[PDB]
Symmetry: D2
Subunit: 319 residues, 4 copies
């Protein structure tokens, strides 16, 4: 098209007078995403089933991300959903960026072929001391870039930076992401709510009340439709493009929520705020949480500002 | 691999002593599904965005299916979700099969990139008179073959015939569907329920009671998880592979349900029963309904037999 | 398109009242050619160079062909350029066909990326005794089908059978070979000659005289252009589509020529004669040679009939 | 792999302290090459043959190159084999580079599917006046970068810059060119000669003598093999990787040779000299010719230094 992601990032880098390190990191991430997307779509699966006479997909996707990021020479600390500790990049390959990611979000949808994706959040190292896990413990408000690749009906890379959110469709015939939605903004009010209602017995009173309103509107408006793919990248992408609200609040399993702060909640909250939406725990903005553990969890409610504000008012009412 | 769908259908045709007409119909459908899959995944999208200086996807998918089926020389009547009247195949291209299909199920999810699919049902012409719409008005029990292609994280073709259900993964590197799950059988009891709960105000008492039991099990077992992608092919495929129950019952917009009998409900009911599951409207088996309109709708409840039976027992209790 | 190779072979099998065994053999060969093509074009090469942290191409191609042919259940004896002995198919996988092939012709051009291909010849088993090498020792005149797949700028499968030659272009986006040139016939006279002139010191007097006439036409016409890719499949395909003559005559390293009779010369001679061309050793028709060794060589001159006849007349003049 | 072309060029740009303009130009060219390669391999050809119910390849390839180069914002003048005049880029899209290219070299091999390719040469604008055709008239010695993409058995991008030549294989599964041959150097002496011998009656005495030596070596060494694909990119690539010599000297058609100086001869001479080889007209170095017309032709002899020197000595002998 007129605009490839490669051209977009290179132009954004030149406008920012970057040294080329962040541009290289973003180019490396795009490469990883294409390698993951091809594996996810099962190109070459015949070679595993004996056509000429292994690693799980999530593990392979982690290896792709890690390898491609270390070889960018732009990173110093990596936090992955798959690794118990932060990965400290070798001194020879060290750059200034800290990346938190989930290489293959929705991995429990993997076997039923439901949409899955990769989520990432990028920070600039904060201190001058040896890179360590604490470099990945900055609040989401410090993000320099975040987004996700969705391996859905087609593969799309959504990238959010200071000035906004842009969506790029992967054209797998030529391995280019094409800019198709510019400076995306979410609708102020949607008509879809997204939550796993199987935890109904464990929900707090405010979530319980809010769902009841979506089904039985007190002003007699049309009830909201319900959608829950069960893969955060897919439900979040729908929320972004169509509007509405996505909820993964606390319950019994965890009064801290299920989703991970560093590489699930923070990245999606950043994309949402850059698109004009909101992302809250129900009590505080996700992006201002000060993380204390790289695998910390957090409740998250995100989406159209009027819908998220309505839920916030209910929590306030109950407080 | 060892088994391509081309080899599988050819061997099944030889074992049945077919003349080759149904084999050719099935080979043509496979070809159409690969062309659809490539368009769905947006291979070549850069050519629509000016890389070198239109039809919607559902329309394109329909043209692919119709053209490829007509050119098989195996059909006489086609019913498509997209066309108001049954298509009567020209005399020169006429064979004995009647095909009912939705070329791109889940079209409302197209723009948010969630999984979408193609659903098909194949019948043998019943009468000796000129082919007409009435040849597509057979109960699903008369199906000779049905299934779907899901364009999800990967593309899979699920084919059900008299002796059972088989799953073939499309390897897009060579354009072959590889047999990956043989003689599939659904779990007797699942732990996921799938329904759009935004219609809660319009549900009948039996659905209402059932959903409440999934959330607050009277036996104190763990509540079922909820999933609702909102694309029938995706929810039904997850139901088949992981077990559980999928529901699209009657509501206010339709006391006859929303999903179409000939090319949504019948094909999915046939796959389910061949896999050892159940498919009911809540009062009668979907496959035994004798349709009177090619675009008739029907309520549908399908999935693991213990789950569907529990819901049928509630209906019976209320009656 | 209107005609896929899958549809073409299935229709040809139905018209011949075949049992489906040769149709299945041809479908399996198509599958093998797509797997080879994808490997030749290096799809997935990044996985050999550490993107996420072996067999030569000719060997891989051979394994693909052998595995796919054995699993067709249509063959009993395979002769490959790569194996010293004929392969005798296990009794359980045995059918009636004998296949001679070069899985990756032009292997010397592999490293410089010039066009390479797969050549095949198919015979019906002749006798009632245990299949053995002798079943592959039939003159090319007994071929039931032959052709090649060229991995050139695009991949094309050329198939010759009793009634003629057809060309099918592989569309790698959907893995279908599309009929693009029907009932192909070679030009009666070309204007290109193809031979390795580095053996000029070893050529017989008739080849020497002929080449001199192409360069200095005694009738003062324009000299023929010269082309010699050095991969038989590529030179022969150009000969078929544009006309002219291809020569690999006897030399010093071999007074019997270099090219192999069973899986290079016979298949190409059969395609040529079905397209209205000629294929001679300079003294007798290639197709009428009764081989005595599966790896026997033969001199070969093939192409437009007026050109080949002019060269045969020189041989006769000298005799 | 470890090294993609995108990473390679970005690192080379940062080492050179470029502003990012040349990096962007090279990234744009890679994008064009992938779009051309997919069209050349005929992905999507089924859509031209009626699968769901035009521009020639050379024209399409020209449109891709021009469009992608103008949108790089890095060029001011473009010279293409397909356009009679130089293209002056619009002031808004103007950068400092001058690009000469043949978008699809070997287009007479197109219909027989022989290897074809794209050749390019990049110059930095020389003067401060309005960009015009004269900006493309610098001797090849001023090139900042040159190379070619070969659409052969696999697609390879060969890029030559001040410090040497590197070869990158296109992995079409992910649209990345992977570095596979680093700092390539041609053999000092080869054993292959490449020339169209159909012009034997029109060759000068030195070429005539040289060919006779390759066939009948006066010191009784083994004669050289002969190869002539008839596509300059293919014959040149073979010469680079295997060694030997490639000749397209003057004759009757033109005592100035056939190949074009600006976008055939200069680029290939630059690649050859950067790889340790030679490229001469027989009388002067190609790279030092001062061009007087954008479509000027020039004789060219190129390849292994010992072989090219031997031919130069023969020309000198004859002078
Ligand atoms: C989830 C992990 O997925 C894979 C792991 C593999 N590990 C190891 N090897 C793999 N592939 C493989 C194995 C043997 C040969 C080839 C092969 C040979 S030629 C060729 C053409 O690209 N591919 C590929 C894998 C493929 C995977 O996914 C296919 C969709
Ligand atoms: C939703 C319908 O989608 C398409 C419709 C098209 N109609 C018309 N033309 C299309 N593509 C197009 C247009 C111009 C040139 C080419 C082209 C030239 S060379 C090439 C290589 O495959 N493709 C393709 C379409 C592509 C579509 O989807 C691509 C992802
Ligand atoms: C010349 C033989 O070529 C190959 C041999 C291979 N053997 C073994 N493995 C191969 N590939 C490979 C290895 C590890 C992982 C994967 C892989 C993982 S996910 C994926 C997606 O297709 N591919 C593939 C091979 C690839 C070849 O060619 C690729 C162009
Ligand atoms: C040599 C020119 O090549 C092409 C020109 C085209 N011009 C115009 N349109 C083209 N393609 C086309 C036309 C209609 C529909 C589509 C299409 C619809 S959906 C889809 C999936 O990518 N592609 C593509 C062309 C394709 C070409 O090459 C195919 C290998
Ligand atoms: N490609 C890019 N896109 C957006 N911002 C960038 C880019 N490159 C650099 N920047 C900005 O400039 C900073 C420093 O760049 P760098 O010198 O490459 O680390 C970044 O951390 C961003 O704030
Ligand atoms: N490929 C096939 N797979 C399964 N059943 C087949 C196949 N081909 C034919 N049959 C059975 O044989 C009947 C008639 O085949 P046909 O002569 O092709 O119409 C079918 O309608 C099926 O009952
Ligand atoms: N697909 C086909 N195309 C052309 N001829 C065929 C085909 N199938 C069968 N035949 C002819 O029928 C004979 C026997 O077929 P079969 O019973 O499959 O072995 C062949 O050996 C050919 O002569
Ligand atoms: N990617 C690159 N690779 C090699 N050299 C480069 C690159 N970018 C810039 N240069 C060198 O630096 C010069 C100026 O770059 P630029 O400012 O982008 O025009 C070039 O003309 C080359 O000499
Ligand atoms: O099954 P549950 O509890 O609804 O959890 C689903 C969530 O878990 C995850 O799979 C974990 O990341 C998310 O993608 C998704 O939103
Ligand atoms: O939006 P609703 O009413 O839940 O309907 C969704 C259903 O409609 C369809 O999109 C139309 O067939 C189905 O794929 C899906 O099951
Ligand atoms: O190098 P030579 O002797 O010209 O032989 C080339 C021939 O050898 C082969 O590579 C081997 O079969 C053929 O494809 C080709 O025609
Ligand atoms: O047919 P001839 O005169 O040998 O010309 C072939 C040459 O012409 C071209 O096709 C023109 O670029 C070159 O690729 C090739 O080297
Ligand atoms: Mn995960
Ligand atoms: Mn549908
Ligand atoms: Mn061969
Ligand atoms: Mn040209």
């Amino acid at each position: 098209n007129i605009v490839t992601l490669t051209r977009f990032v290179m132009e954004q880098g030149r406008k920012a007078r970057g040294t080329g390190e962040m541009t290289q990191l973003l180019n490396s991430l795009c490469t990883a995403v294409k390698a993951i997307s091809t594996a996810v779509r099962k190109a070459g699966i015949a070679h595993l089933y004996g056509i000429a006479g292994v690693k799980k997909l999530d593990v392979l996707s982690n290896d792709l991300v890690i390898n491609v990021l270390k070889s960018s020479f732009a990173t110093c600390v990596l936090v992955t959903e798959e690794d118990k500790n932060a990965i400290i990049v070798e001194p020879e390959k060290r750059g200034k960026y800290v990346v938190c990611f989930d290489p293959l979000d929705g991995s429990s949808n993997i076997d039923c072929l439901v949409s899955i994706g990769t989520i990432f959040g990028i920070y600039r190292k904060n201190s001058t001391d040896e890179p360590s896990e604490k470099d990945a413990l900055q609040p989401g408000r410090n993000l320099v870039a975040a987004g996700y690749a969705l391996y859905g009906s087609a593969t799309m890379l959504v990238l959010a930076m200071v000035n906004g959110v842009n969506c790029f469709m992967l054209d797998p015939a030529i391995g280019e992401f094409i800019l198709v939605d510019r400076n995306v903004k979410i609708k102020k009010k949607g008509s879809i709510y997204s939550i796993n209602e199987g935890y109904a017995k464990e929900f707090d009173p405010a979530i319980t009340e809010y769902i009841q309103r979506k089904k039985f509107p007190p002003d007699n408006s049309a009830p909201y439709g319900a959608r829950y793919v069960g893969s955060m990248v897919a439900d979040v992408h729908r929320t972004l493009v169509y509007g509405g609200i996505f909820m993964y609040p606390a319950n019994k399993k965890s009064p801290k929520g299920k989703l991970r702060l560093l590489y699930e909640c923070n990245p999606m909250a950043y994309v949402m705020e850059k698109a004009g939406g909101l992302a809250t725990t129900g009590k505080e903005a996700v992006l201002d949480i000060v993380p204390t553990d790289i695998h910390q969890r957090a409740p998250i409610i995100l989406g159209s500002p009027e819908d998220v504000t309505e839920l916030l008012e209910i929590y306030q009412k109950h407080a």
